[PDB]
Design a protein around this ligand. Structure first.
Ligand SMILES: O=c1n(C2CCOCC2)nc(-c2ccnc(NC3CCCCC3)c2)n1-c1ccc2ccccc2c1
Length: 329
């Protein structure tokens, strides 16, 4: 046989014969293929020995399990799951199949800012994020490289969350505990980068990253401070203080289209949602539902899309069988 092996760079793709003309589309190594059974192009992801360590295995199992707990157009949906290996003893690799997409969100970020497309992309992120939260899934590590887009501007989130750390919320950076609106920060970080065309909060580690957060947004309120653990609290309170730049100064008018009255209004609304999403204190940060009702977003609102019906430690030997069972069903 049912399988055939093809060399794609260094790794060998042993896939079902239904999948033809494999081409590399990013590195878990990923391939574009034509599905002869479905008569449509697919993306196939190869998990090379996912059971190899606690980190690789826990994510692989969790995400394989969650891909059947989720049913939404803005979240990845599996078309097929298979392994070439015949038994548990021989079991090495896992191959995952989904609809082929046109672009990564990193590429779309580089593009010129258009309000119709930006708001629809952001609307879709919020729909997917809401669908996860409705199913009891808070992402905590939402980033553009794990988001894919079609030419018709339809969007899909590829992973299920908790390496690029820039889009992580203050509560993740400082280990605070969280609610659903932790993912709002990440959305704000993507939305801001689409405007500035620069990573808002860069850094080689969390120290640099936090410095970038406070320099631009200012030192958080005392209420935020007392929610920190004593050792983290000590560090944050003893950081050099900043007033924080205003959002008109964070994202100047020059970064927005202002050739019409429609664009001038949408620019103020966009800067306004940013000021409600890029809020350090999660107690003050906008929720998913309120972000969906915001004038900049609610133009796309749809009840069918928005309002949709919805862990242990093991050895490498135990993870192998757990993953194998899910593949074989
Ligand atoms: O894992 C990825 N990535 C990248 C790899 C590079 O680093 C970041 C994540 N890109 C895609 C993927 C999915 C669908 N379509 C595409 N198409 C590409 C065509 C070329 C231009 C970029 C998008 C990629 N996938 C991918 C592919 C199949 C998958 C199957 C099941 C579950 C998740 C999957 C994810």
């Amino acid at each position: 046989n049912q399988f055939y092996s093809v060399e794609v760079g260094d790794s060998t793709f042993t896939v079902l014969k239904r999948y033809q003309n494999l081409k590399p589309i990013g590195s878990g190594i990923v391939c574009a293929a034509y599905d002869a059974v479905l008569d449509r192009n697919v993306a196939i992801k190869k998990l090379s020995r996912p059971f190899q360590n606690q980190t690789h295995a826990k994510r692989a199992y969790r995400e394989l399990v969650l891909m059947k707990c989720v049913n939404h157009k803005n979240i990845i949906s599996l078309l097929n799951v298979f392994t070439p290996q015949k038994t548990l003893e021989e079991f090495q690799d896992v191959y995952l199949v989904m609809e082929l997409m046109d672009a990564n969100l990193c590429q779309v970020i580089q593009m010129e800012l258009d309000h119709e497309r930006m708001s629809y992309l952001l609307y879709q992120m919020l729909c997917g994020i809401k669908h996860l939260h409705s199913a009891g899934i808070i992402h905590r590590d939402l980033k553009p490289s794990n988001i894919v887009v079609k030419s018709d501007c339809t969007l899909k989130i590829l992973d299920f969350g908790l390496v690029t750390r820039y889009y992580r919320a203050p509560e993740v950076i400082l280990g605070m505990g969280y609610k659903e609106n932790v993912d709002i920060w990440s959305v704000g970080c993507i939305m801001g980068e689409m405007v500035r065309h620069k990573i808002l909060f860069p850094g080689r580690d969390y120290i640099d990253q936090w410095n970038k957060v406070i320099e631009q947004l200012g030192t958080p309120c005392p209420e935020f401070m007392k929610k920190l653990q004593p050792t983290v609290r000590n560090y944050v309170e003893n950081r050099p203080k900043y007033a924080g730049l205003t959002f008109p100064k964070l994202f100047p008018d020059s970064l927005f289209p202002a050739d019409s009255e429609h664009n001038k209004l949408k620019a103020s609304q966009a800067r306004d949602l940013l000021s409600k999403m890029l809020v350090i204190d999660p107690a003050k940060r906008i929720s998913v539902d309120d972000a969906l009702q915001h004038p900049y977003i609610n133009v796309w609102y749809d009840p069918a899309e928005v309002e949709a019906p919805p862990e242990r430690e093991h050895t490498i030997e135990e993870w192998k069988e757990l993953i194998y069972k899910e593949v074989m069903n």
